[PDB]
Amino acid sequence: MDMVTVTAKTVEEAVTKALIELQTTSDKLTYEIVEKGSAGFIGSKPAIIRAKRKETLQDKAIEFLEQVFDAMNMAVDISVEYNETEKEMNVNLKGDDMGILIGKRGQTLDSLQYLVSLVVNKSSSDYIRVKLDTENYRERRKETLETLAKNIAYKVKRTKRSVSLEPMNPYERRIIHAALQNDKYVVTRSDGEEPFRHVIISLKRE
Amino acid sequence: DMVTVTAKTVEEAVTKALIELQTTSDKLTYEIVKPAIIRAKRKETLQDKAIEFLEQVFDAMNMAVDISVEYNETEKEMNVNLKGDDMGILIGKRGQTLDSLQYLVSLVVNKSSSDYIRVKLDTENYRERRKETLETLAKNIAYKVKRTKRSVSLEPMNPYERRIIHAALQNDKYVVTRSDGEEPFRHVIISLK
Numbered sequence: 114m115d116m117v118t119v120t121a122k123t124v125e126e127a128v129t130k131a132l133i134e135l136q137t138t139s140d141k142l143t144y145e146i147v148e149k150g151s152a153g154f155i156g157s158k159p160a161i162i163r164a165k166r167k168e169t170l171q172d173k174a175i176e177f178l179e180q181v182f183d184a185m186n187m188a189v190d191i192s193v194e195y196n197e198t199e200k201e202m203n204v205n206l207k208g209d210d211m212g213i214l215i216g217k218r219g220q221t222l223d224s225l226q227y228l229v230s231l232v233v234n235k236s237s238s239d240y241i242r243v244k245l246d247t248e249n250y251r252e253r254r255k256e257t258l259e260t261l262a263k264n265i266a267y268k269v270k271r272t273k274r275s276v277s278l279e280p281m282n283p284y285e286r287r288i289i290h291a292a293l294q295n296d297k298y299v300v301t302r303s304d305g306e307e308p309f310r311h312v313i314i315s316l317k318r319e
Numbered sequence: 320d321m322v323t324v325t326a327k328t329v330e331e332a333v334t335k336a337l338i339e340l341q342t343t344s345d346k347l348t349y350e351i352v353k354p355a356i357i358r359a360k361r362k363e364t365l366q367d368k369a370i371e372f373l374e375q376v377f378d379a380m381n382m383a384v385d386i387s388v389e390y391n392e393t394e395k396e397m398n399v400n401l402k403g404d405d406m407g408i409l410i411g412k413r414g415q416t417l418d419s420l421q422y423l424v425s426l427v428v429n430k431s432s433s434d435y436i437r438v439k440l441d442t443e444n445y446r447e448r449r450k451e452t453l454e455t456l457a458k459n460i461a462y463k464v465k466r467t468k469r470s471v472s473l474e475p476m477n478p479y480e481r482r483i484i485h486a487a488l489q490n491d492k493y494v495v496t497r498s499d500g501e502e503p504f505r506h507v508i509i510s511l512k
Contacts, residue, residue: 177379184375185427214426221426224419231416232380283478284502307479 116165124149124160131164141167170233171195174204174243177232181225187211201242202233211247218250220282255288262292265314266299275315280305286312321350321358332357365428365436366390369399372427376420377401382408397428397438406442413445415477450483457487460509465493470510475500481507 117134121127124146132142144164151158171193182189189208195201206222214221226245233243265276278289286303289312293301296317303312322340326332332355337347342361350358363371366388373386382405390397409416421440428436439446460471473484481498484507488496497508 180379181376181423184372184379185423186430217426220422224422227415227419228376228380231412287478 114165116163118147118161118163120159120161122150122152122160124162127160127162128164131162135164135166137166143167170237170241171202171204173236174202174229174233177229178204178206178225181228182210200239201244204229204243204245206245206247216279216281218247219254219285222246222250223282223284254285258285258288259292262289262314266293266296269314269316270298273316275313277304277313278311280309280311282308283310286310321348321360323356323358325354325356328355329357333359363431365397365432368431369397369424369428369438372424373399373401373420376423377405382406395434395436397436399424399438399440401440401442409442413442414449414480417441417446418477418479449480453480453483454487457484457509461488461491461494464509464511468511470508472499472508473506475504475506477503478505481505484509 117131119127119131119134121130128142128144131144132139135142142164143166144162147161147163148158150160174193175191178189178191187208187210189206189211191204191206193202193204195203211218222245226243229245230241230243233241261278265278269276281289290301290303293299293314298317299314300317301312301314303310305311322336324332324335324339326335329351333349336359337344340347340359340361346361348360348362352358369388370386373384377384383403384401384405385403386399386401388397388399417440421438424440425436425438428438456473460473464470476484485496485498488494488509493511495510495512497510498505499508500506
């Protein structure tokens with residue numbers, strides 16, 4: 114936490130001074146009063162305050178996540194774009210460690226996202242949309258799954274033998290189901306208890 | 320940090336306070352430093368590690384909960400229960416939040432493990448109570464739909480919940496189960512026939 118300490122004739126002035134040096138605005142300032150001054154002709158004594166910028170909402174997201182990734186013994190670069198008027202935060206995670214959890218990225222982006230959102234939203238009277246992603250992983254994940262869907266349809270279609278995908282979170286499972294929604298030769302249906310729950314692709318009947 | 324033991328080489332020394340500290344070979348860290356001495360502790364428990372992590376996350380959310388964690392080693396399985404007044408702030412949310420915490424915690428525990436550990440997170444049996452009042456919900460709309468002969472859309476819910484519904488009317492010899500909508504507005508639709 115930044116906190117600059119400022120000094121001046123009265124608390125009132127100190128504040129104004131701090132606003133200038135903080136380049137913030139009245140509605141964006143926290144401060145604590147160290148000492149209100151005095152004068153006495155002239156036993157004068159400056160007023161002193163300590164002041165930061167009032168903490169931002171992206172501030173609170175980053176903080177939460179650093180706290181969590183750190184708890185997870187992981188190194189990650191967080192950055193956020195908040196669109197005030199549109200009321201959405203977009204938070205990108207790049208970083209060497211982010212790379213490790215490969216398949217596991219989906220659900221981990223998901224959980225973390227859900228949480229970051231509780232956190233941001235409890236500090237906010239308006240509802241905020243927080244999206245938590247890595248270098249377009251969500252999109253590029255979607256493509257590759259939709260591709261998986263199509264390729265392994267071909268396989269069933271061709272080998273006549275039924276194929277079970279690896280386990281996946283429901284969100285992804287849906288991408289598959291949908292990818293094959295109207296395939297003339299193949300059908301999909303998901304099985305298993307979580308988290309070993311998968312889609313099965315097999316040839317359509319009747 | 321650690322404690323000191325002295326014997327013959329390092330091995331007669333290794334076997335030493337392995338006894339004194341009631342621990343076993345797999346769980347014990349070792350510092351290789353007429354005499355012969357070493358340093359050793361009994362390494363961080365998976366519970367120690369689960370509690371650690373959650374403790375940290377709840378700290379980050381400004382909540383004070385009481386975690387407790389039973390762990391059946393032979394089964395390689397760990398049950399975690401949290402509670403306390405502060406869990407009131409999770410009222411509507413509970414399930415999602417419980418699931419999201421569950422995932423990251425499992426994530427952490429298995430990192431620090433060779434054999435795969437199956438971990439479940441739950442406040443005070445909520446998990447089951449919730450399954451129950453949903454199955455009940457399923458059956459009541461089931462009742463209702465064949466009574467209006469029409470058809471109804473339930474509220475939005477996550478997939479986990481949606482499965483619970485589908486499951487409940489899976490056999491229901493008079494009415495159909497269809498999921499629909501777009502997250503976070505995906506719902507089940509029970510329809511006649």
